[PDB]
Design a protein around this ligand. Structure first.
Ligand code: FES
Ligand SMILES: [K+]
Ligand SMILES: [Mg+2]
Ligand SMILES: [Mg+2]
Ligand SMILES: [Mg+2]
Ligand SMILES: [Mg+2]
Ligand SMILES: [Mg+2]
Ligand SMILES: [Mg+2]
Ligand SMILES: [Mg+2]
Ligand SMILES: [Mg+2]
Ligand SMILES: [Mg+2]
Ligand SMILES: [Mg+2]
Ligand SMILES: [Mg+2]
Ligand SMILES: [Mg+2]
Ligand SMILES: [Mg+2]
Ligand SMILES: [Mg+2]
Ligand SMILES: [Mg+2]
Ligand SMILES: [Mg+2]
Ligand SMILES: [Mg+2]
Ligand SMILES: [Mg+2]
Ligand SMILES: [Mg+2]
Ligand SMILES: [Mg+2]
Ligand SMILES: [Mg+2]
Ligand SMILES: [Mg+2]
Lengths: 97, 122, 137, 99, 49, 86, 72
RNA sequence: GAGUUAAAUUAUAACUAAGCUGUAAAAAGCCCUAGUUAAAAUAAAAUAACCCACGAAAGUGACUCUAAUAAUCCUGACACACGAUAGCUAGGACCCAAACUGGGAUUAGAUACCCCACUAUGCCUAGCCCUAAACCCAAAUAGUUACAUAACAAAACUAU
């Protein structure tokens, strides 16, 4: 008879889960600019999750997309393409101190 | 589209470039392929020097061809382009639009795992 | 004073000339700093050698030539021979990792030679020849 | 006699909802040279540093404004059966209470 | 629905009749797929240059 | 060998100093892990050792990054005790 | 052993009406010429069960599963 | 299965230099060498990977395409199929690493650790051999958190 007892309902304050940078977006091996932002400009290495910040699905796709462009002849391997050196920075690594 | 042809051609003038595409598209049709469209990516400096047919190439034009073809004729198309000398590096991949972008919900946070050791006094 | 670490790309036109010549016209100083020897060679923009110097040629012998001081002396001697042919600025390329990397870099500076750009070209195989086995010292 | 269930429904704590980003006023009950122990009505007491402006009027019993972030700081570390509490609360100073 | 869109898409397919026209048209209309991404997830199109 | 020269792993000096520029180059290589990679490629390690090395590097990285969080989490509990001699 | 005809519409694009009125280009795109081995198995399985099984709509029956294994 | 090659290395050519490799320190070896520039074949697959996926296991992480991962979803051998690495038989490849062997050094001796050279072989095609700390030392299928700490470790237990 007591209406003050709590009801068995889900949490109404569940904030939506965080979206990665490339969530709901289609990666490709033809757009060099998108792939080049995740490559160290001085060396040409590929950043990991702790630097890129992407989720578990788009990190593998970027890795496969980049390597496809390495062999098919669309982007340099040992360095970042200088034409896309002024693109906005998305990684969290800083070299200059 | 079903197949995509990552075609890179040696840099040359307008007439022979059109001729090279004309016979390349003819070769695809002879193997039983219905080409959808031709996309031009312009001429760009190659990322690195590529050796093909006893030549060192630094500049070339990029072209993209998408078509529907039987699975058994992919080897014939690749072999034919290998003997052609006006193409520097041909490659065939499945068209990316064939696969659908899988729906995503978010980055699910993984809680730290417990109960990995006994509760005895260390 | 906006200064960019990245080198001036040859495709573009950067108004940054040293001694009246462009970036690519400046000669090159190749430095091979091995674990037992350091070899220094300066070549022109057309890859024509100008002067050569190494720890062995400067009187150091055996284990002595692998020390930093031996590489430091080689840089002074190499710069002195290079400056005789009339070169002021040079782009230094470092090959390999060794004890003589720092000494050779500052050896050229104190030898009357000025450097403007540093490049590391250590041979890094990507999977390549199988190296030698371990040493159970 | 009022049932305990009704008390929780109308209690200010329940009406607050999530503790993150909530403007809650509190009263200072202890003063150190640079630390202000503030009770905002929660289970524990938050600690804040005296601001450089109007710092001389922050005395015992003074009311201030706070922005609660976590009601009770508590985390889990590997190898710990039970979480290690801090016995404090996290909050920031927005100024003094405007009487 | 799937066969209906292929019915319309069949009109623009390249045949031997219009082999020359499509080649000539392609060589005069370059296009690129390049586009950058920002921290917040907004798409930046380099075509604005 | 096929790529353009004087683009990758290259820095330029400023104001005429070379010691500062060289240290900047070393930080770039150390961050990208090339310095340790060259050290491990002087000799060859069997694949048995490679997995044993990555099972110790990963364990250290978990323990170090977990102890570090507790240090920062408990860092605020270092003020002078207000109840001394209570 | 069975040999499905090449110029046949695949399993999905058969019961939809208005196919024979379409030009040869679209019919070519839907035939087995532009279909991989996976689509070929569907045609073989569909035809095989319609010749030996009594009730094709029943899948949990033992006879239906034996036909499916025989195709593989 | 089929096709393909980025980074390194080597045959080889040009130029300069007289020395080059090597160690805690040396000797031997090389001087047909070393540095730079240009460059096949063979072999091996940086960063991604702080990810933990696929396969029955042993295993697999350079790229592309084709074929493709049993069972309407229990247990089961001495039967059928498979099984890293080393080893054998025949043909082909050989950058580089390298048991054996020779030389140098160390030592009372060193047919060992250290240094230099090179072979089997590691590789491709066809066949055989069927062994591992083949170990996550924890058998398969369903479950329970009740009862209850030999020790140690990766908590305890029930049913077929
Ligand atoms: S979180 Fe949705 S794809 Fe990354
Ligand atoms: K590789
Ligand atoms: Mg090469
Ligand atoms: Mg040979
Ligand atoms: Mg001698
Ligand atoms: Mg030589
Ligand atoms: Mg693994
Ligand atoms: Mg199984
Ligand atoms: Mg299965
Ligand atoms: Mg059984
Ligand atoms: Mg075997
Ligand atoms: Mg074997
Ligand atoms: Mg063998
Ligand atoms: Mg025998
Ligand atoms: Mg043999
Ligand atoms: Mg041999
Ligand atoms: Mg050898
Ligand atoms: Mg001997
Ligand atoms: Mg094993
Ligand atoms: Mg056993
Ligand atoms: Mg077992
Ligand atoms: Mg069993
Ligand atoms: Mg089973
Ligand atoms: Mg079980």
């Amino acid at each position: 008879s007591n209406e003050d007892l709590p009801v068995p309902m889900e949490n109404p304050y569940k904030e939506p889960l965080k979206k990665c940078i490339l969530c709901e977006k289609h990666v490709d091996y033809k757009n060099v600019q998108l792939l080049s932002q995740f490559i160290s400009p001085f060396t040409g290495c590929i950043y990991g999750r702790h630097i890129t910040g992407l989720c578990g699905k788009k990190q593998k796709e970027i890795t496969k997309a980049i390597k496809r462009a390495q062999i098919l002849g669309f982007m340099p391997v040992t360095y970042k393409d200088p034409a896309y050196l002024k693109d906005p920075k998305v990684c969290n690594i800083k070299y200059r101190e | 589209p079903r197949y995509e042809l990552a075609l890179i051609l040696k840099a040359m003038q307008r007439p022979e470039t059109a001729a090279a595409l004309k016979r390349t598209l003819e070769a695809l049709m002879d193997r039983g392929a219905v080409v959808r469209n031709l996309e031009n990516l312009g001429e760009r400096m190659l990322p690195y020097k590529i050796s093909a047919h006893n030549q060192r190439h630094s500049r070339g034009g990029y072209f993209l061809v998408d078509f529907y073809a039987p699975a058994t004729t992919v080897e014939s198309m690749m072999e034919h382009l290998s003997r052609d000398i006006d193409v520097i590096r041909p490659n065939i991949v499945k068209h990316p639009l064939t696969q659908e972008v899988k729906e995503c919900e978010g980055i699910v946070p993984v809680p730290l795992e417990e109960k990995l050791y006994s509760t005895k006094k260390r | 004073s906006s200064f960019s670490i990245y080198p001036p790309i040859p495709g573009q036109e950067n108004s940054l000339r040293w001694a009246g010549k462009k970036f690519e016209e400046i000669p090159i100083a190749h430095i091979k700093a091995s674990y037992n020897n350091t070899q220094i060679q300066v070549v022109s923009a057309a890859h024509q050698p100008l002067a050569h110097a190494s720890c062995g040629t400067e009187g150091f012998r055996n284990a002595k030539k692998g020390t930093g001081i031996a590489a430091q002396t080689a840089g002074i001697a190499a710069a002195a021979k290079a400056t005789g042919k009339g070169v002021t600025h040079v782009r230094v390329v470092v090959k390999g990792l060794g004890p003589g990397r720092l000494s050779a870099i500052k050896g050229l500076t104190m030898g009357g030679l000025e450097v403007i750009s540093i490049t590391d070209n250590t041979p890094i195989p990507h999977x390549g020849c199988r190296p030698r086995k371990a040493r159970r010292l | 006699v009022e049932s305990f269930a009704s008390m929780l429904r109308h209690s200010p704590l329940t009406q607050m909802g999530p503790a993150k980003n909530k403007l809650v006023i509190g009263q200072i009950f202890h003063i150190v040279e640079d630390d202000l122990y503030i009770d905002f009505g929660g289970k524990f007491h938050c600690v804040c540093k005296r601001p450089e402006v109007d710092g001389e009027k922050y005395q015992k019993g003074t009311r201030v404004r706070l922005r609660l972030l976590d009601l009770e700081l508590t985390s889990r570390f590997l190898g710990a059966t039970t979480d290690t509490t801090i016995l404090e609360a996290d909050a920031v100073l927005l100024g003094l209470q405007e009487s | 629905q799937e066969v209906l869109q292929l019915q319309e898409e069949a009109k623009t397919f390249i045949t031997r009749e219009n082999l020359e026209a499509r080649v000539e048209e392609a060589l005069d209309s370059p296009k690129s797929y390049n586009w950058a991404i920002t921290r917040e997830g907004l798409v930046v199109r380099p075509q604005q240059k | 060998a096929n790529h353009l020269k004087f683009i990758a792993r290259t820095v330029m000096v400023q104001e005429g100093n070379v010691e500062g520029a060289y240290r900047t180059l070393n930080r770039i290589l150390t961050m990208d892990g090339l310095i340790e990679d060259i050290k491990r490629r002087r000799y060859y390690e069997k694949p048995c050792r490679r997995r044993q090395r990555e099972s110790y590097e990963t364990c250290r990285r978990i323990y170090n990054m977990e102890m570090a969080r507790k240090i920062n989490f408990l860092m605020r509990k270092n003020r002078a005790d207000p109840w001394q001699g209570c | 052993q069975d040999d499905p005809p090449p110029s046949m519409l695949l399993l999905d694009y058969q019961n939809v009406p208005g196919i024979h009125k379409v030009d040869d280009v679209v019919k070519r795109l839907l035939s087995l010429e532009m279909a991989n081995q996976k689509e070929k198995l569907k045609i073989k399985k569909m035809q095989l069960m319609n010749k030996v099984l009594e009730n094709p709509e029943d899948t949990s029956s033992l006879e239906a599963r034996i036909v499916a294994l025989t195709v593989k």
